Short mmCIF file of C-alpha atoms and ligand atoms in Angstrom, two decimals:
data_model
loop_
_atom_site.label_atom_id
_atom_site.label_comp_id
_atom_site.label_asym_id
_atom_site.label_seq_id
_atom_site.Cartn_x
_atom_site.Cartn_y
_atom_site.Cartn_z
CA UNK T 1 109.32 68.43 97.95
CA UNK T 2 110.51 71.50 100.17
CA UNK T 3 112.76 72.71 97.33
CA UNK T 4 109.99 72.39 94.35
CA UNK T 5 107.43 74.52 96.74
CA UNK T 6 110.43 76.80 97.81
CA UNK T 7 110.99 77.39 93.83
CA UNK T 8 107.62 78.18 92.73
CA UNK T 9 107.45 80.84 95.96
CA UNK T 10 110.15 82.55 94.39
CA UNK T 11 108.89 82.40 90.96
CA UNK T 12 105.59 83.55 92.20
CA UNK T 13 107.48 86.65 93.88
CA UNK T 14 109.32 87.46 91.30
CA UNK T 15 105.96 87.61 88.94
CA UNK T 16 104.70 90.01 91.99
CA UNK T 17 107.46 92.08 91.33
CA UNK T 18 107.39 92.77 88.15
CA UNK T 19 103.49 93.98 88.09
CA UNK T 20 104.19 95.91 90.93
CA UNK T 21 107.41 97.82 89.09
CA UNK T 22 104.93 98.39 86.75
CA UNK T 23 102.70 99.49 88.83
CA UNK T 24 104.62 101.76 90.63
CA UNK T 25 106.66 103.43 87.68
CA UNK T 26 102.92 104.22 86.02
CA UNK T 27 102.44 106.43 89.23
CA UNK T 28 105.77 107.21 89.11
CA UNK T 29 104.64 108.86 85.47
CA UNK T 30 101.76 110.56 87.18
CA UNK T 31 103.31 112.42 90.20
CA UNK T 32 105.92 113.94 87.85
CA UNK T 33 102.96 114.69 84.96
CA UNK T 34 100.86 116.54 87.98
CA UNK T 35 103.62 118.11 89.60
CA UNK T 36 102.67 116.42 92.53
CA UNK T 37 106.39 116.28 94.30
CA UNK T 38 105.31 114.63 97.62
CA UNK T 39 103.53 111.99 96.08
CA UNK T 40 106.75 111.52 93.72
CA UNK T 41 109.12 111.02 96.45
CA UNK T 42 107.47 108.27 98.28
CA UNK T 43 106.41 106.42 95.04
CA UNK T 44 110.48 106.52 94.22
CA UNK T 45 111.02 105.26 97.75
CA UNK T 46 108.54 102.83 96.71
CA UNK T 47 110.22 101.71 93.14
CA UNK T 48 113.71 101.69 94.18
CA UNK T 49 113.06 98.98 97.06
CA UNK T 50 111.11 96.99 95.11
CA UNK T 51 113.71 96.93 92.37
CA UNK T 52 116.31 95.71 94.48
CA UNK T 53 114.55 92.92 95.08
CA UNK T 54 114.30 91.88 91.71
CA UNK T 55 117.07 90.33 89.77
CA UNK T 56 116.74 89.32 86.52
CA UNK T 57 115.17 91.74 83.80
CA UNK T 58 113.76 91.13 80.88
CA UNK T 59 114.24 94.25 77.68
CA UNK T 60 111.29 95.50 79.09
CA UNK T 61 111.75 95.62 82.46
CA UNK T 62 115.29 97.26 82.21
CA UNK T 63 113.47 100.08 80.08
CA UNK T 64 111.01 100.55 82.81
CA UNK T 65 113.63 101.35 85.55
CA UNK T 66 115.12 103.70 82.93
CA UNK T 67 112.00 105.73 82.80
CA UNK T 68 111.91 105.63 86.24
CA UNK T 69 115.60 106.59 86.95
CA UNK T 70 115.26 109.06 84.09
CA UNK T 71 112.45 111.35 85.90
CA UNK T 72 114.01 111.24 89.57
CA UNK T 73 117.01 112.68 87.95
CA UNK T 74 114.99 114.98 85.78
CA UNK T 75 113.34 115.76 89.06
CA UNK T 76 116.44 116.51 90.81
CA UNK T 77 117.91 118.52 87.98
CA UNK T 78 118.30 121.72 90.35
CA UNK T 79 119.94 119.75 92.89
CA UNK T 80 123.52 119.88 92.18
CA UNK T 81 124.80 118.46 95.45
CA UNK T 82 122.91 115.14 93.97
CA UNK T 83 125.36 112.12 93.16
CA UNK T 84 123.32 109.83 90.98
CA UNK T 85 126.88 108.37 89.48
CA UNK T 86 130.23 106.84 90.84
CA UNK T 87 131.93 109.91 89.19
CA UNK T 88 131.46 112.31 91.36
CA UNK T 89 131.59 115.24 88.77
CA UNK T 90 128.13 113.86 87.14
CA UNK T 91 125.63 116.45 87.64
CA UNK T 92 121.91 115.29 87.27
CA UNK T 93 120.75 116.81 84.21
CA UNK T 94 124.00 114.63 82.35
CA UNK T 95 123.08 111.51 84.29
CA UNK T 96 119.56 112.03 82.61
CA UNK T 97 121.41 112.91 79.23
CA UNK T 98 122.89 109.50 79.54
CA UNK T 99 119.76 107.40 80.61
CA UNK T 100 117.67 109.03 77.61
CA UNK T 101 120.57 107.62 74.81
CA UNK T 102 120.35 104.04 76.28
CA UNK T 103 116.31 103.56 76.81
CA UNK T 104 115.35 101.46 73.41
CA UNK T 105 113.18 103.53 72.20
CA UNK T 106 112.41 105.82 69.19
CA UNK T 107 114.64 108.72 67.90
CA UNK T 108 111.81 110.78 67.09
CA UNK T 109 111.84 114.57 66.58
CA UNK T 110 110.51 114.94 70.34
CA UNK T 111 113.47 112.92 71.16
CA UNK T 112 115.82 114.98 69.70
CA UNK T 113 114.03 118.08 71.09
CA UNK T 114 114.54 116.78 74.60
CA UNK T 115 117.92 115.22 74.29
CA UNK T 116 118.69 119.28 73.09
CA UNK T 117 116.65 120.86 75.96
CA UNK T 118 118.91 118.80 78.65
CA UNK T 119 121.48 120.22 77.25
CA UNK T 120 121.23 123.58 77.20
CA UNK T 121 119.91 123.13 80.81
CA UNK T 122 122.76 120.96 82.31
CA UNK T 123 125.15 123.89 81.03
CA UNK T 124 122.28 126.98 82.40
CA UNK T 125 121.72 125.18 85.86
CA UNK T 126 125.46 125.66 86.62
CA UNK T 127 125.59 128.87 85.54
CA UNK T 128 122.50 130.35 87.46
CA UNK T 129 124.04 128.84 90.44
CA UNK T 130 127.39 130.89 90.12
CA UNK T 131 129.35 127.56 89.08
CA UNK T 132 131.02 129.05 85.55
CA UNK T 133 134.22 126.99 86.08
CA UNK T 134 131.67 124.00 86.52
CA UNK T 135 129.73 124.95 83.53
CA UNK T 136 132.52 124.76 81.01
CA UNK T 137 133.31 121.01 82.78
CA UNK T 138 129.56 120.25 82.02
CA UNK T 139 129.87 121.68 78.40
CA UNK T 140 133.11 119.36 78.04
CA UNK T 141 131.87 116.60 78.93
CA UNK T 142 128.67 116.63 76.64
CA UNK T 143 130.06 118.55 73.39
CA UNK T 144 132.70 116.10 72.18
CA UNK T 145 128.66 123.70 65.54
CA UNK T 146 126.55 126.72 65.42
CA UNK T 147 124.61 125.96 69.32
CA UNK T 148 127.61 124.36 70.69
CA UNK T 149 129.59 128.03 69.86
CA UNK T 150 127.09 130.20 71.22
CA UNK T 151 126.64 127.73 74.87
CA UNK T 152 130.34 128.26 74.62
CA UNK T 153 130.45 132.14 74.20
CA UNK T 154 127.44 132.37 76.96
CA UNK T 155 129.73 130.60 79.39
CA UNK T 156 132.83 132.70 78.76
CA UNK T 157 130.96 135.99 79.07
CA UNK T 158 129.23 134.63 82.64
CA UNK T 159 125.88 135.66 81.46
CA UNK T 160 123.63 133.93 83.82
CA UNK T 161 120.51 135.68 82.55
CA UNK T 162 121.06 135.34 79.04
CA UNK T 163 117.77 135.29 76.85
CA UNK T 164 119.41 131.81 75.28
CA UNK T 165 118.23 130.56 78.09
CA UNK T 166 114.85 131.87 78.43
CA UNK T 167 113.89 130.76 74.88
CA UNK T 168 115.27 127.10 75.31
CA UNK T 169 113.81 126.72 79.30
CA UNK T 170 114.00 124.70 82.00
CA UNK T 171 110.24 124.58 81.77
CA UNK T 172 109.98 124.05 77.81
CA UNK T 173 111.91 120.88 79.12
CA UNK T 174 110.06 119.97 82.04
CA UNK T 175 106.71 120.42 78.95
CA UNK T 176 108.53 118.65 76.26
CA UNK T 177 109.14 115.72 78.65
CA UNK T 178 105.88 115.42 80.09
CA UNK T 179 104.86 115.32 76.60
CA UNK T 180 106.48 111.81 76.18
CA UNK T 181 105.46 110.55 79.82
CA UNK T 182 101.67 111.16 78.97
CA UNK T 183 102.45 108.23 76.19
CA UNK T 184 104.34 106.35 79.00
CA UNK T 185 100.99 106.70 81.05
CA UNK T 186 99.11 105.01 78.00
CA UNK T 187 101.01 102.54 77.24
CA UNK T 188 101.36 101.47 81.01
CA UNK T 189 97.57 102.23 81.89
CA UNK T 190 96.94 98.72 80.84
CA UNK T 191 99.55 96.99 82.92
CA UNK T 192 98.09 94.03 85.46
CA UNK T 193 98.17 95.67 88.60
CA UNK T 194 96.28 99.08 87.61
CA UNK T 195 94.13 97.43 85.19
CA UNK T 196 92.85 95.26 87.82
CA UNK T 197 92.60 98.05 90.85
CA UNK T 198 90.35 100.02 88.06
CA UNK T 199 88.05 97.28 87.60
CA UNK T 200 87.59 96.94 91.33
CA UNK T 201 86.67 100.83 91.69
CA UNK T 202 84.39 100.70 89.10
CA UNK T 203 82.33 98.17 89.86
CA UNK T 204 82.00 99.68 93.33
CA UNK T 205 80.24 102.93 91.49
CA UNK N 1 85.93 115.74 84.64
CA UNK N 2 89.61 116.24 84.98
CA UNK N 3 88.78 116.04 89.06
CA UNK N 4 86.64 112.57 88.79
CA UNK N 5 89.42 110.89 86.99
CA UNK N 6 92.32 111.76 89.28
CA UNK N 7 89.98 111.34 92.03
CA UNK N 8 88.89 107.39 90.16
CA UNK N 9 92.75 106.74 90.07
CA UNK N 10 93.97 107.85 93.51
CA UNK N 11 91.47 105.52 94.63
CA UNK N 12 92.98 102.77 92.40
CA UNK N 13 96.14 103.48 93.49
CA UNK N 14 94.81 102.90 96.96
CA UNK N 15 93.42 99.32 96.20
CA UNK N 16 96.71 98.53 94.99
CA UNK N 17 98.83 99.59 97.92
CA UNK N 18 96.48 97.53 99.85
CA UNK N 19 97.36 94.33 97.37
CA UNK N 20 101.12 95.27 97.51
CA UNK N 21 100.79 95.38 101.35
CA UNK N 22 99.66 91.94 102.11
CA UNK N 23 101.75 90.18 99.26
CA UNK N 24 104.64 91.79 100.90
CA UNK N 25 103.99 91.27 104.20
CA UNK N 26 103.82 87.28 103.27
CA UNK N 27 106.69 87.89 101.70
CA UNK N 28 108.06 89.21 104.84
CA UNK N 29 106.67 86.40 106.95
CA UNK N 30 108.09 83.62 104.51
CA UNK N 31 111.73 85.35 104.82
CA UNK N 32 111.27 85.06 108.66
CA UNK N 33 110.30 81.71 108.78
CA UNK N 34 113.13 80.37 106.74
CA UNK N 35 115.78 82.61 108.36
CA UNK N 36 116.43 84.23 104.71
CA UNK N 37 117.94 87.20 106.32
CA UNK N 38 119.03 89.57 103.12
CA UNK N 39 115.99 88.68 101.46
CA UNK N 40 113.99 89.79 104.67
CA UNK N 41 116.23 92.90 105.00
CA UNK N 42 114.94 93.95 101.35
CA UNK N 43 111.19 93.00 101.86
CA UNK N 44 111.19 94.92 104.97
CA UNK N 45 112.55 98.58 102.99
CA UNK N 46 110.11 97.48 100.27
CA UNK N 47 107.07 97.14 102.85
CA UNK N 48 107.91 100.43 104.67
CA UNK N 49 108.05 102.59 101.45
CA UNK N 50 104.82 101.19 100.70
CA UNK N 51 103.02 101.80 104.07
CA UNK N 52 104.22 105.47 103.84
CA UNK N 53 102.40 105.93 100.61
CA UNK N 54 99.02 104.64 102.34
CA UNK N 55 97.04 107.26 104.31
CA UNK N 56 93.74 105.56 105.59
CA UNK N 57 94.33 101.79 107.14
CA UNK N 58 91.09 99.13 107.13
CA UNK N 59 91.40 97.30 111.14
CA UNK N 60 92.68 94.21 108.33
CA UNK N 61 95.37 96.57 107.67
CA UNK N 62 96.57 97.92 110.12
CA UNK N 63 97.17 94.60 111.65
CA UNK N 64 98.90 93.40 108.75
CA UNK N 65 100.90 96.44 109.25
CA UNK N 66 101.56 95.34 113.08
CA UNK N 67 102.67 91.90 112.15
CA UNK N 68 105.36 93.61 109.65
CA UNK N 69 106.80 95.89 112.54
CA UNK N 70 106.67 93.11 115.36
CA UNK N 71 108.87 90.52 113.32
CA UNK N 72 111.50 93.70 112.44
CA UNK N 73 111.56 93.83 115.77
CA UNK N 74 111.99 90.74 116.86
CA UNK N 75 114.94 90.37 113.91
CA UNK N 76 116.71 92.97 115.68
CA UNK N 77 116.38 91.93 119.71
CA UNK N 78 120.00 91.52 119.90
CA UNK N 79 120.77 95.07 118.12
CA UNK N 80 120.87 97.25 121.49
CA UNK N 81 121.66 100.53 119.83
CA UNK N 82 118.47 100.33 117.33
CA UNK N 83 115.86 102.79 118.19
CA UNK N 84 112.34 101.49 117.51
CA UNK N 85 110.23 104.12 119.88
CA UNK N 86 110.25 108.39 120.17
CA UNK N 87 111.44 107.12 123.46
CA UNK N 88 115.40 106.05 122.76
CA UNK N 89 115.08 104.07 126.07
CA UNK N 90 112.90 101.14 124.63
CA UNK N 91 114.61 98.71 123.72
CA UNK N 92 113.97 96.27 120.37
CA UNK N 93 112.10 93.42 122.40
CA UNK N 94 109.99 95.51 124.36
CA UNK N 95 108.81 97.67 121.16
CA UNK N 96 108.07 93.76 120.05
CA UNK N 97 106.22 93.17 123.21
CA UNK N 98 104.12 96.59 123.51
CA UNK N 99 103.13 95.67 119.47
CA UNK N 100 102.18 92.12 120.35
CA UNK N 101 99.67 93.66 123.16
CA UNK N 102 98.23 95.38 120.68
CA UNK N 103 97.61 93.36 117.83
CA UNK N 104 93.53 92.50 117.42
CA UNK N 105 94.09 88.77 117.89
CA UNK N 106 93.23 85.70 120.09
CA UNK N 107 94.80 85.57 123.33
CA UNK N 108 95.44 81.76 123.17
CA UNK N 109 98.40 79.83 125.30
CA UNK N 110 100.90 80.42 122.15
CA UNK N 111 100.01 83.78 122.84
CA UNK N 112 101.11 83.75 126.68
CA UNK N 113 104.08 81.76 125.69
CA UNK N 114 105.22 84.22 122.94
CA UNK N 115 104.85 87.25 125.50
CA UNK N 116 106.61 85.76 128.26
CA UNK N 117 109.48 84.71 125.95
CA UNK N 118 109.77 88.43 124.74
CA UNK N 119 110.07 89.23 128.57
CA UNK N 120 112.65 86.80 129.82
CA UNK N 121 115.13 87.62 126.76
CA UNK N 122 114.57 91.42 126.81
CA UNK N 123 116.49 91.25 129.94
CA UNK N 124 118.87 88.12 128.63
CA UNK N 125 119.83 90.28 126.03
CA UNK N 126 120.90 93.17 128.32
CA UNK N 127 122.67 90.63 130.39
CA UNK N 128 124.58 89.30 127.71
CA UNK N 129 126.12 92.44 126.09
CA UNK N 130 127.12 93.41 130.44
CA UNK N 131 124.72 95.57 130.29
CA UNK N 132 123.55 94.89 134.64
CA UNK N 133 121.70 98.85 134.82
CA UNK N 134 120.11 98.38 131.69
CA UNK N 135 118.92 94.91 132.61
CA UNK N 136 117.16 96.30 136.24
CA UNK N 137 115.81 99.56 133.97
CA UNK N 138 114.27 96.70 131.54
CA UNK N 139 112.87 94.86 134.18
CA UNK N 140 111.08 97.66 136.13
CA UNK N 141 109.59 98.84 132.52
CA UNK N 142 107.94 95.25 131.68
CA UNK N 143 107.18 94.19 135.14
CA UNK N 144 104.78 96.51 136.94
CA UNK N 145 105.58 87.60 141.39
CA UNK N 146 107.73 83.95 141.54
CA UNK N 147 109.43 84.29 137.52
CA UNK N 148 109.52 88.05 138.31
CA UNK N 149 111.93 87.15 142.14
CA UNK N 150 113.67 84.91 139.56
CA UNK N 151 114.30 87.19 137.30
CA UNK N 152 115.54 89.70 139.81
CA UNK N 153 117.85 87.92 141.56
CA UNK N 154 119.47 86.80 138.21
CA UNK N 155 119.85 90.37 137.36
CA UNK N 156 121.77 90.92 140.60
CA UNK N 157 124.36 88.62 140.63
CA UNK N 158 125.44 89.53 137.14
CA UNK N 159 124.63 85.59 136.47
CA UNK N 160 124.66 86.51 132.51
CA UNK N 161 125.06 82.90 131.44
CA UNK N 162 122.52 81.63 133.90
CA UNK N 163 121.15 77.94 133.38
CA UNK N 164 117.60 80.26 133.48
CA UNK N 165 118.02 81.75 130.20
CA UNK N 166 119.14 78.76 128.47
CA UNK N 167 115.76 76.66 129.67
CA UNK N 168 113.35 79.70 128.38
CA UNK N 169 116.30 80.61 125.60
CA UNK N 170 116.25 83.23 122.66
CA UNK N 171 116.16 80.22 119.97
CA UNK N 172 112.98 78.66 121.86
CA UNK N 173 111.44 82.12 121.08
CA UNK N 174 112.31 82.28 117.93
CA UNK N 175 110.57 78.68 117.25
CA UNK N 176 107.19 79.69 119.09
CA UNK N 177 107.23 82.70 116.88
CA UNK N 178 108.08 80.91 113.94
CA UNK N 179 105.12 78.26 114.66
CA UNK N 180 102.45 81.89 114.75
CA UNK N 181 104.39 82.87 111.49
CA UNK N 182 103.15 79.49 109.91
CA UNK N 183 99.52 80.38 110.75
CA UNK N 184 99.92 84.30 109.05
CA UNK N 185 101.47 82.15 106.49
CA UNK N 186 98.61 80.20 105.30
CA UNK N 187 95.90 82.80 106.22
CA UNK N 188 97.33 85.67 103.75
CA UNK N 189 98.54 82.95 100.80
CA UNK N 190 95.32 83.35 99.38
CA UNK N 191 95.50 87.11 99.15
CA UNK N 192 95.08 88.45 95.76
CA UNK N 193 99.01 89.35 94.27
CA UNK N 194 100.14 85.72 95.72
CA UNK N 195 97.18 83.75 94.63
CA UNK N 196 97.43 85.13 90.77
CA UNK N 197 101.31 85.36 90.62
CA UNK N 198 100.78 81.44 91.74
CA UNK N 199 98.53 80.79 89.27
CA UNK N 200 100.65 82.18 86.44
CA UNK N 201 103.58 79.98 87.78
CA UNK N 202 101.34 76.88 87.76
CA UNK N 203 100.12 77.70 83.94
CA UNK N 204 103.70 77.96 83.09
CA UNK N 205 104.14 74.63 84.40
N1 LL0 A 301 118.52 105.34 92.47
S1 LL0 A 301 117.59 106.25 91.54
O1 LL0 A 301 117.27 107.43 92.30
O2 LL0 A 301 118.26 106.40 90.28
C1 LL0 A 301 116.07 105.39 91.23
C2 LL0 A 301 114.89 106.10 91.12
C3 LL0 A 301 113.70 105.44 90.88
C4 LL0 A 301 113.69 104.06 90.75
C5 LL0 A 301 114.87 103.34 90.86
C6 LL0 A 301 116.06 103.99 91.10
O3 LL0 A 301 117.26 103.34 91.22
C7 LL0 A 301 117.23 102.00 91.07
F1 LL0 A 301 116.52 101.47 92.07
F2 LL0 A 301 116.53 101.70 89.96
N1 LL0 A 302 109.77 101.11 110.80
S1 LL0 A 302 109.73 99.54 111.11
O1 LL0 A 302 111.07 99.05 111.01
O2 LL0 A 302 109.03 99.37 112.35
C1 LL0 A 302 108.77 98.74 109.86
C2 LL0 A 302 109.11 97.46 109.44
C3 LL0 A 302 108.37 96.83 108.46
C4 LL0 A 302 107.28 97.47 107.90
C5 LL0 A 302 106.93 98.74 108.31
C6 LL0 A 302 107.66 99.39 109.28
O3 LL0 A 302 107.36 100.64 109.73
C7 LL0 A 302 106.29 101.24 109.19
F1 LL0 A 302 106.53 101.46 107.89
F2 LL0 A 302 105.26 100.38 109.20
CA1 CA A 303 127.90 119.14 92.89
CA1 CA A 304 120.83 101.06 123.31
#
């Protein structure tokens, strides 16, 4: 039975590969919580090959490589010479506006909050990087009363620096959303993989 | 303790890149072994990501680690313009034969056989693509006396499709490698990932 032992390899692998996506998107979580962008980059290295070698996803799988896609572009938010879409005009903070409105998960009030901050910030990276034509493309494109006029009058009046800006943040965004990764990290302490890696270090102290 | 947990789970981390590393170099060895060519394409970019996110390699290791970069390659030896060395002279088969002199294993006749395989079609290669200077430079670099006046005076008369190099041929290396990938094979199929991904197949069953 070559085929029967080549089909329970695969299925074997394929069980691999989901506790290491797991695995990988819990330190994934980490890196981004700690600000630790070296370790961050390789562990995306890390979760993007391994997801291309998996094929089908369960519900929860496909909201794990969410989470994961959503921080790298989070991550990236600065970086507007990024392409994370086919359209080219996609900037990284609306890619991430567009990942967040597709993961199944609660609309809380934190939800809201961040959905708000990415905003805000998708219209105020352009705009601190000269791009004001770009900015009104970016504020097109999400809006699709009150906020919306006021990102609007900001942009016509090219006021970079504008204390709108300060009070809504691009680090009240990068806190708001490490606020909901610290209850990815719970929720995926307990995964296989790091469960079982813990109980190994332990019982070595 | 804010230091002793990060400190706890770096070192977890580390466990698991170790588990990830042998599952996937199986993984690796499997593709190899049944000539699954995409499917070894995507385990090798998994396996390197990986091996950049570990820092300190157990002698187990790093000749797990070996075994990955000899069969990449050895998948390559008829890709002339990859570059596996700092030194863009060395070609694919000899950075396959300067790993296999290196890897902490027995020296046994499939050993020999293996090596002088590499050597013969390191230069067949070169012959084959009309590559004569390349051929001699290949020759001087591996040897480094009656294969080696063999070898030599094939190189001279340009004899590319030489009666030689089908006798001791590229596919005959390929199958003495294959028959070392079978031992690797059933050696790491008991390491951790495999052995419980296999035995939530079998429960499943
Ligand atoms: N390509 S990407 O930068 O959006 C990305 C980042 C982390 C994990 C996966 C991933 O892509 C796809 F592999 F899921
Ligand atoms: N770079 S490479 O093509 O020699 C290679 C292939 C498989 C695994 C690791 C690896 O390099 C290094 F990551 F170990
Ligand atoms: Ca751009
Ligand atoms: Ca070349």
């Amino acid at each position: 039975e070559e085929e029967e032992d080549a089909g329970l390899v695969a299925e074997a692998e394929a069980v691999a590969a989901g506790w290491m996506l797991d695995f990988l998107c819990l330190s994934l979580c980490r890196a981004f919580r700690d600000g630790r962008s070296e370790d961050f980059r390789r562990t995306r290295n890390s979760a993007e090959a391994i997801i291309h070698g998996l094929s089908s996803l369960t519900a929860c799988q496909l909201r794990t490589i969410y989470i994961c896609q959503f921080l790298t572009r989070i991550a990236a938010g600065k970086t507007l010479d990024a392409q994370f879409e086919n359209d080219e005009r996609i900037t990284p903070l609306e890619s991430a506006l567009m990942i967040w409105g597709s993961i199944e998960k609660e609309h809380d009030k934190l939800h809201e909050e961040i959905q708000n901050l990415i905003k805000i910030q998708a219209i105020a990276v352009c705009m601190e990087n000269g791009n004001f034509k770009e900015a009104e493309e970016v504020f097109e494109r999400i809006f699709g009363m009150p906020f919306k006029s006021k990102l609007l009058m900001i942009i016509s009046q090219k006021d970079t620096f504008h204390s709108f800006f300060q009070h809504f943040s691009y680090n009240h965004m990068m806190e708001k959303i490490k606020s909901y990764v610290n209850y990815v990290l719970s929720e995926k302490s307990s995964t296989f993989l790091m469960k079982a890696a813990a109980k190994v270090v332990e019982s070595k102290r």
